[PDB]
Amino acid sequence: GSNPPPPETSNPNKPKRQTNQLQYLLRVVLKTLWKHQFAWPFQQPVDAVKLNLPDYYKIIKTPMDMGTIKKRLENNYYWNAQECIQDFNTMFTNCYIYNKPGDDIVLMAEALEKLFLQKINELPTE
Ligand SMILES: CNc1cc2onc(C)c2cc1NS(=O)(=O)c1cc(Br)ccc1OC
Ligand code: NA
User: Fold this and answer.
1) What ranges do the domains of the chain cover?
2) What is the DSSP secondary structure assignment for residue 100, as one 8-state letter?
3) Of 26, 29, 117, 121, which residue has the fewest beta carbons closer than 10 angstroms?
């Protein structure tokens, strides 16, 4: 097992901008998920070598983590909040795909996902 390159956090070929919604996603949504007790497995790309997970990138082809999401928001990688929201969902979904119902990591992802959904219920309109 080697690790694949991490997801891009910059791209000259990809339209990007700042929005009010994206700023909230960084300052309020991301920051509250990042500081939760259960953030730690999701703060960086999965290191399948150091975690001894040789099948991780056999199963998961569109990997995502909050480290990547944070650097994207900070770099203004996104065109809109929906793209950023989709990266969160990919993150959660990957966890639920690779693992099983009730697994410790799954229960952590579910808890972060609940909090995420709450927080983005307060997302401004443009
Ligand atoms: C079962 N190991 C893991 C599965 C994972 O799915 N998505 C991620 C991210 C992820 C990370 C691990 N490895 S781990 O962080 O050391 C880990 C976390 C938790 Br909660 C419980 C068990 C773990 O490793 C046995
Ligand atoms: Na699964």
Assistant:
1) 19-123
2) -
3) 121
* Residue whose entry in the numeric block shows the structure tokens 């975690």: 51
Q: Which atom of ligand 1 is nearest to the CA of 108?
A: 20
Report how far ligand 2's centroid is from the alpha carbon of 54 (Å): 16
Interatomic CA distance for residues 90 and 79, integer angstroms? 17
Integer Cα distance of 97 and 109 in angstroms: 12
Q: Which two tokens stand for residue 58?
A: 């056999």
Q: How far is CA 7 from CA 87, 106, 108, 115, in A?
A: 11, 22, 23, 24
Q: Is the CB of 92 under 6 A from ligand 1?
A: no
Angle at 115 between CA 112 and CA 120, to 5 degrees: 120
Q: Where are the alpha helices (DSSP H) in the chain?
A: 20-24, 31-35, 56-59, 66-74, 81-98, 104-121
